[PDB]
Amino acid sequence: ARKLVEQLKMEANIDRIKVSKAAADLMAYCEAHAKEDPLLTPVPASENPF
Amino acid sequence: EAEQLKNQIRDARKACADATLSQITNNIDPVGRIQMRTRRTLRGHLAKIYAMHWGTDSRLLVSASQDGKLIIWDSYTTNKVHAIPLRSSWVMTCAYAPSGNYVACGGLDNICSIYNLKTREGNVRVSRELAGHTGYLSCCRFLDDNQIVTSSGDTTCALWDIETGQQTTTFTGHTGDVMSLSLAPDTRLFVSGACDASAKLWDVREGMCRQTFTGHESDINAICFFPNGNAFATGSDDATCRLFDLRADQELMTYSHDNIICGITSVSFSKSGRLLLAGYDDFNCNVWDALKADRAGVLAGHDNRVSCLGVTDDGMAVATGSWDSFLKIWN
Amino acid sequence: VQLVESGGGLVQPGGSRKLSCSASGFAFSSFGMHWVRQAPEKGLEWVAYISSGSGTIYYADTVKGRFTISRDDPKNTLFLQMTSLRSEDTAMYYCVRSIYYYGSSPFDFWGQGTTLTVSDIVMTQATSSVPVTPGESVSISCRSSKSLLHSNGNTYLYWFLQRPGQSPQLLIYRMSNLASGVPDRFSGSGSTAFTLTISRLEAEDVGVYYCMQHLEYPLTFGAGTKLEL
Amino acid sequence: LGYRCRFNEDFKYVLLPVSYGVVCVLGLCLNAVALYIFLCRLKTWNASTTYMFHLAVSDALYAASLPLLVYYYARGDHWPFSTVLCKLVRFLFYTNLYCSILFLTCISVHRCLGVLRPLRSLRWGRARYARRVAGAVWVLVLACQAPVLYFVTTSARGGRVTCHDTSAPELFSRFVAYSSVMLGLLFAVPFAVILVCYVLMARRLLKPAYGTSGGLPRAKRKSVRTIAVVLAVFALCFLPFHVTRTLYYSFRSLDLSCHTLNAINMAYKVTRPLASANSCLNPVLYFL
Amino acid sequence: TLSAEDKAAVERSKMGIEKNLKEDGISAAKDVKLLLLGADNSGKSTIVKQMKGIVETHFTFKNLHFRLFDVGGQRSERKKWIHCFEDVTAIIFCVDLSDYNRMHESLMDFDSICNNKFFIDTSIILFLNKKDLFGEKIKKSPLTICFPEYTGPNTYEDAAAYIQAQFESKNRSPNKEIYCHMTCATDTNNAQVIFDAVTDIIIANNLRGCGLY
Ligand SMILES: Nc1ncnc2c1ncn2[C@@H]1O[C@H](COP(=O)(O)OP(=O)(O)OP(=O)(O)O)[C@@H](O)[C@H]1O
Numbered sequence A: 001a002r003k004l005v006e007q008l009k010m011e012a013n014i015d016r017i018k019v020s021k022a023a024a025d026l027m028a029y030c031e032a033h034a035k036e037d038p039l040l041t042p043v044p045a046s047e048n049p050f
Numbered sequence B: 001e002a003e004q005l006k007n008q009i010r011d012a013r014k015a016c017a018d019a020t021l022s023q024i025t026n027n028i029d030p031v032g033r034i035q036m037r038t039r040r041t042l043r044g045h046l047a048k049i050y051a052m053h054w055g056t057d058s059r060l061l062v063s064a065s066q067d068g069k070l071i072i073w074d075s076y077t078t079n080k081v082h083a084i085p086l087r088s089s090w091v092m093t094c095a096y097a098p099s100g101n102y103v104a105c106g107g108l109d110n111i112c113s114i115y116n117l118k119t120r121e122g123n124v125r126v127s128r129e130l131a132g133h134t135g136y137l138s139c140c141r142f143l144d145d146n147q148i149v150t151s152s153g154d155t156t157c158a159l160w161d162i163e164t165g166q167q168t169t170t171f172t173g174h175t176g177d178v179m180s181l182s183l184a185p186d187t188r189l190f191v192s193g194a195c196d197a198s199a200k201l202w203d204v205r206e207g208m209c210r211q212t213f214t215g216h217e218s219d220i221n222a223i224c225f226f227p228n229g230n231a232f233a234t235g236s237d238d239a240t241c242r243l244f245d246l247r248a249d250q251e252l253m254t255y256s257h258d259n260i261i262c263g264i265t266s267v268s269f270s271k272s273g274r275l276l277l278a279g280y281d282d283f284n285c286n287v288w289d290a291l292k293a294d295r296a297g298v299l300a301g302h303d304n305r306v307s308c309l310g311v312t313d314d315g316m317a318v319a320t321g322s323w324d325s326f327l328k329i330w331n
Numbered sequence C: 001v002q003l004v005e006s007g008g009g010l011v012q013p014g015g016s017r018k019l020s021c022s023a024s025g026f027a028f029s030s031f032g033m034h035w036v037r038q039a040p041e042k043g044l045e046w047v048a049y050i051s052s053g054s055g056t057i058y059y060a061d062t063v064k065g066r067f068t069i070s071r072d073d074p075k076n077t078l079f080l081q082m083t084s085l086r087s088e089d090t091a092m093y094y095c096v097r098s099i100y101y102y103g104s105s106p107f108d109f110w111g112q113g114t115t116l117t118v119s120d121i122v123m124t125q126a127t128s129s130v131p132v133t134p135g136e137s138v139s140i141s142c143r144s145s146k147s148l149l150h151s152n153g154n155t156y157l158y159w160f161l162q163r164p165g166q167s168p169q170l171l172i173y174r175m176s177n178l179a180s181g182v183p184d185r186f187s188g189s190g191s192t193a194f195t196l197t198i199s200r201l202e203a204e205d206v207g208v209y210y211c212m213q214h215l216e217y218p219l220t221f222g223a224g225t226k227l228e229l
Numbered sequence D: 001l002g003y004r005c006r007f008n009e010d011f012k013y014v015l016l017p018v019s020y021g022v023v024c025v026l027g028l029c030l031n032a033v034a035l036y037i038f039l040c041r042l043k044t045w046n047a048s049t050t051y052m053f054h055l056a057v058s059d060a061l062y063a064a065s066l067p068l069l070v071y072y073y074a075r076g077d078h079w080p081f082s083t084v085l086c087k088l089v090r091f092l093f094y095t096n097l098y099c100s101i102l103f104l105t106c107i108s109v110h111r112c113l114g115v116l117r118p119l120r121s122l123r124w125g126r127a128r129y130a131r132r133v134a135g136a137v138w139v140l141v142l143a144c145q146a147p148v149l150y151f152v153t154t155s156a157r158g159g160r161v162t163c164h165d166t167s168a169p170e171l172f173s174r175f176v177a178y179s180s181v182m183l184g185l186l187f188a189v190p191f192a193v194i195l196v197c198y199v200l201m202a203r204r205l206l207k208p209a210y211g212t213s214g215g216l217p218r219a220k221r222k223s224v225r226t227i228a229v230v231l232a233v234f235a236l237c238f239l240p241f242h243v244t245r246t247l248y249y250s251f252r253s254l255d256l257s258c259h260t261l262n263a264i265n266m267a268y269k270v271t272r273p274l275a276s277a278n279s280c281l282n283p284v285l286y287f288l
Numbered sequence E: 001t002l003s004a005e006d007k008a009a010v011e012r013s014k015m016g017i018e019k020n021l022k023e024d025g026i027s028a029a030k031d032v033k034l035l036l037l038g039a040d041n042s043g044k045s046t047i048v049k050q051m052k053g054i055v056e057t058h059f060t061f062k063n064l065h066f067r068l069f070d071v072g073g074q075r076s077e078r079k080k081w082i083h084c085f086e087d088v089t090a091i092i093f094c095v096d097l098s099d100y101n102r103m104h105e106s107l108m109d110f111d112s113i114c115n116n117k118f119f120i121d122t123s124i125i126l127f128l129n130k131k132d133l134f135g136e137k138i139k140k141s142p143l144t145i146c147f148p149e150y151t152g153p154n155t156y157e158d159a160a161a162y163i164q165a166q167f168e169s170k171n172r173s174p175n176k177e178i179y180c181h182m183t184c185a186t187d188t189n190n191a192q193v194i195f196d197a198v199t200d201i202i203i204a205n206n207l208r209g210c211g212l213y
Helices: A002-010 A019-032 B002-016 B021-027 D012-041 D049-064 D066-074 D083-116 D118-122 D128-145 D147-151 D172-205 D218-253 D258-287 E004-028 E044-051 E101-114 E131-138 E156-168 E190-209
Strands: B038-042 B049-054 B060-065 B069-074 B080-085 B091-096 B102-107 B111-116 B125-131 B137-142 B147-152 B156-161 B166-172 B178-183 B189-194 B199-203 B209-213 B220-225 B231-236 B240-245 B250-255 B264-269 B275-280 B285-289 B295-298 B308-311 B318-321 B327-330 C002-006 C016-024 C032-039 C043-050 C057-059 C067-072 C077-083 C092-098 C129-131 C138-144 C157-162 C168-172 C186-189 C193-198 C208-213 C225-228 D154-156 D161-163 E031-037 E055-060 E065-070 E090-096 E124-129
Touching: A002 B002, A019 B021, B021 B250, B049 B308, B049 B318, B060 B091, B060 B318, B069 B102, B069 E004, B080 E004, B102 B137, B111 B137, B111 B147, B147 B178, B156 B178, B189 B220, B189 B231, B220 B264, B231 B264, B240 B264, B240 B275, B275 B308, C002 C092, C016 C092, C032 C067, C043 C067, C043 C077, C057 C067, C138 C208, C138 C225, C168 C186, C193 C208, D012 D049, D012 D066, D012 D258, D049 D066, D049 D083, D049 D128, D049 D258, D066 D083, D083 D118, D083 D128, D083 D147, D083 D161, D083 D172, D083 D258, D083 E190, D118 E190, D128 D172, D147 D172, D172 D218, D172 E190, D218 D258, D218 E190, E031 E044, E031 E190, E044 E055, E044 E065, E044 E124, E044 E190, E090 E101, E090 E190, E101 E124, E101 E156, E124 E156, E124 E190, E131 E156
Parallel strands: B049 B091, B091 B137, B137 B178, B178 B220, B264 B308, C129 C225, E031 E065, E031 E090, E090 E124
Antiparallel strands: B038 B327, B049 B060, B060 B069, B069 B080, B091 B102, B102 B111, B111 B125, B137 B147, B147 B156, B156 B166, B178 B189, B189 B199, B199 B209, B220 B231, B231 B240, B240 B250, B264 B275, B275 B285, B285 B295, B308 B318, B318 B327, C002 C016, C016 C077, C032 C043, C032 C092, C043 C057, C067 C077, C138 C193, C157 C168, C157 C208, C186 C193, C208 C225, D154 D161, E055 E065
8 A cells, every 4th residue: 555655645746737728738739730631621632642 | 645645636636627628629610520531441351350550651551350360551552561370360459660660469369479571581470479468468559679568458568678578667557457558759658548447647768657547437448649749538438538638637528429329449639639530339430529529520431340440640541440351541 | 592593504506495493591482583684795684574473474575485484382493494595595594583562672682693505665874884993982873765753653773783703782672772781872863864872982892783674564774884993 | 816716805904904013013112122222221242142132133124024014915915016025025024034933942042051051051152152153043044035035926816916925826836845845944943942942941940959948949930930931922923823824835735615725714814913923022021 | 553563563462462361261261169168167178178368279070170269367357358259159158066156156157148248149058067076966965055945856857957947047038049068077979069059050040141030
C-alpha cells in the first residue's frame, strides 16, 4: 500500500491549468491544420492517388 | 490516505473545469456530412482480419488475419508485396516499423515476433522473438528499428531492445488486462487502456505511471493519440468513445448515441484532429466530429464486425479491416 | 549470394552449346533471371529474360529463335540453349538476378560470366576515356533518345560500374536511388540527360561505367565510359 | 388438318387463359422479388444460392413466355402474329420448363450430398463448381430444346389459323419420337434422382445421434417435413402433366373412338395448369 | 501495367503470392478446429495426451485433421479472447465426476459457456470422465452430498444420469446440442466419439445452410 499512496502523492503535482485553454488548444490545432487535411476538404480526382 | 489523495485529485480536476469543450466549440460551423467512398478492396485474406497498420510512406500497409498470414499490400495498385506466414495464427496485433524494414506481430502465443522485410536472400524472415509477457499480446508499436513497446493481458506493458531481446522497462499499475497502446508523436510517452476501465499515461524513459483516467464504465478496447500529442481518445465496451487531456487530466468530450449499443473495436484520428473515426460492432464505422458530439459519416461497406482501422500519414486515405476478411480504402 | 555459370568454350560455326547458371544463397524461385552478353569490345548487351515462375519470357532482337532460356527452381539452375552460333556470338555471358515488386532493386547481383568462343531507346555515352585524379570529385553522364520518366514517377535509368577483371556492380537502380552495399559518395541525378556524380573520389573505383534502361522490353545499354587514373 | 375425329374443347378457352395469366402474374412478381433479394440483400453465394438464383431466372423466363399463350388461347386458338414469334415463344416455354426441373434436380443432389457425405461434400472450394454445373445445365437444356424451334410452325384451318404446340401435322411421327426421347431423358432421370435423393436423405435424417437426449431435434424434423412437402409438390405439379401428355401423344398417333381422344384431351389440358403453377410455387416453397 | 517493372510486379502479385494463398486456403480447409475446456485435473489434459500461452494439439483420425486448442493456460479474462474461437466446429467440455466442489464449479462454468453469445449455434461434446472412480466412490457415499435436492436412488446409473441431466438442463438453445459421453482413463474410443459428434454437427450445419427450415 505504501507504493500506491506514494504514486498517488507524486501524481498530485501536475499543475493542471486552464481547461478552457485545454479546449482552445485542440481548437487551434484543428483550425490551423484544416487545409492540410485531405479528408476534411476532399481533393479532386486528378490529384487523388486513388 | 488513498481516499484522501483521490478526493484531492477530484477537487483539482473540478477546480480547472471552468468551460466545457461543447460550449466553446459552438461558435464554429460543423464539418457537415462527410462523404467518403470505397476506392480499393483487398481480397486476399480468408479468415477474419484482426489488426492492420500503415507504413510511413502512406502507400504500403500491413494487415494480420486469423489464417496466419501477414500480407503487405500496395494500396495504390492493389498488388500484394509480401505474404509472411505466422507460426501462431492467433494474432491480435501487428505493426510497421517507421523505416519500413521490419514488421511485428503477436497474440495468444505470448510472443512478439519481429520480421525482416529487406534482406539479401530475397525473402522475409523472422528477426527476433520477444518473450516475457504472461498474458496475450494485444498491441505493439515500434519506437525505432531497435525499440518496441508492447502491451499484454498480464496487466503490464514493456519496452524492449530488439537486438538484446530483453525488456528494458516494465510498466505496472493496471489491474485489468491492457488492451491497446498508442505512441506519442515524439515517442516519449504513450497511453494504454486496460480492462479495469481506466487509461494510464506512461513515461518510457522514467518507467512509471504519470496520470490515470477513469471515465469509462467497461473495458477499454482501443486508444489513440491526438496529433498534437497532449490528448487522446478511448473506445470501450459500453458504446462510448471519450476524449481525455493530459494537462487537464480528466474527460473532455463524449462520443456516444442512443441508437449505438455496441462496443468500439478501433479508433483513429485525422491529420488535423477534426475527424474521429471509430469502428463498431454494427458492422460499420462511424465518423465523429472530434470538436463536437455529432456524427459526420458512416463507413458502411463491411458486412461483419470492423476490427481494425487507421489513417495514412499524409491523411489521404483510411483503411478499415473487418471480420468479413476484407480491407477497404476510403477517400 | 553467389551466381556461378559454366559451359563456355570454343564453338565451331553452325554448332550448338548450352549455358548453365548455378545459384545459391538466395531464394531463386522468387527472382526473375537475366542473361547479359559482353563482347570483347567492352560493350554490354542483353540476351534473354525469364520471369519468376517461368512466365513472361523475352529474347533479344538478334538471338530470337536461335536461343532458348529455361530454368528449374528445385535444382536452382538457369539454362540458356544456343543453336547455330555465329561469329557475332563470340562474347562472355553473365547471369543476373532481378526481383520486381514495389520499391525493389532490380539487377542487384551479377554472376561471374563464362566466355564463349565462336570462330528502341538508344543510350549515348559520348565521353569514352576520362583521366581520373584520385581525391578529386568526378562526373559521368549518359544520354537517351526517349525520356525514361514514366507517368508513375519511376525513371528507369540504371548505373553499373565494371571493375577491371570483374563483374558489373549495381551502383544505382533508379535515379537518385543508392543501392545496397555501395558507399554514400556516389550520387545520381538528371531527368533526357542523366548524370552520375562521385563526390570525393577515392581509389578502388577505377573502371568502366555503363548506363542502362528498363522502360521497354527492348533493353539497351550505354557506351563504355572509362575512368583511367 | 382435316382430322377424322374433331374434339370438343370448350373448357380450354376459359381455363387456360385465366390459369396462365394468374400464374404469369404471381410467378413474375415472386421471381422479380427473389432476384431482388438474391442480388441486393446479400452478394455472397454458396453452392446452393447459385442454384436457387438460376432456378429463379428459369421460372421468371417461363412466366415471361406466358402472355403470348394466354392471348392466343383467349382469342379462341387464333394466331395474329408471325410464325417465328410463336416458334420462339414455344421454345422459351419448354426450355424454361425443363431448365427449372434440372435446377431442382441439382438442388436435390446438393442437399443429399450435404447430408449423406457431409464433411467430404462440404469442406472444399465449391463455388466455381456450382457455376460450372449451372452453365452446363443451361447449355444442355438449350441444345436439347433447340429442335422445337424447327418443329413448331403455323397452319390455317379454313379461315382458322393456329400455332402448333406440337409439330406440323405431316411430320408428327418424328416429333412423337423426339418428344418420347426428351420425356425420358429430361423427366424420368430427374424425377427418379430427386425422389431417391430426398428419400435417402430423409432416411438418414431420421437416424438419431449417440449422445443425444430426448426426441429428434426440431431441425432434423422440420427438414424432413420440408423434404416431404417439396417432393409431394414436385410430383403433383409434374407427374400427371407428363403422363397425360404421353397418353395424349400416343393416342393421337394411334387413333381411337372420339370419346377417348376427347377424354385424354380434357385430362392433359386440365393438368397443364399444375405444371404451369409449379413455377410460381417454387419461390414460396424455397422461402418457407 | 503501363511499365515493364509494374507489369512484372503485377505478375508477381497475381502469380506467386496468390498461388501460395490459394494453396494455403486449400490445405487449411481440411482441418477441424475444436476448443477444449474443463477443470483442473478433470482429464482434459489426459484425453488430449491420449489422442496425441495457448497449447495447440493436432492429430489425424479418419482423414480429418483435428486441432484441439487447450486454452487453460490463459490466466487472463475469458471474455477478451473467447471470440477468437468463433469458427470452431464444437467445444469439448470435460467434467470430473469424483468430487463435488469442482462439480458445482463445472455446473457454473458450463452454464456460462453454453449461453455465451458467440456459442449460441456451437454444439458441445460434454465428457464425464473418471466414471470408474465415480462408481467406486458412490458405492459407499451418496450423491445427496453434492445435490441436496436429489431424491433418486444412490446407485451408479441413476446418479450418473442425474448429473448428465443436470448439465443438459443448462441448454436453452434449440439449435445447440450437447453430445454427452461417459469415459474413463482406460477408455480409447474417445476419438471415434468426437468423430461421430463432429459428423453430426457438420450434417446440422449443412441443414442450416441449405435453406431447409
Ligand atoms: N388427332 C386430332 N384430331 C382432332 N384434332 C386434333 C387432333 N390433333 C390435334 N388436334 C387439334 O390440333 C390443334 C393443335 O394441334 P397441336 O398438337 O399442335 O397442339 P396441342 O399439343 O394438341 O395442344 P394445343 O392445341 O392447345 O396447343 C389442337 O387444338 C387440337 O384441337
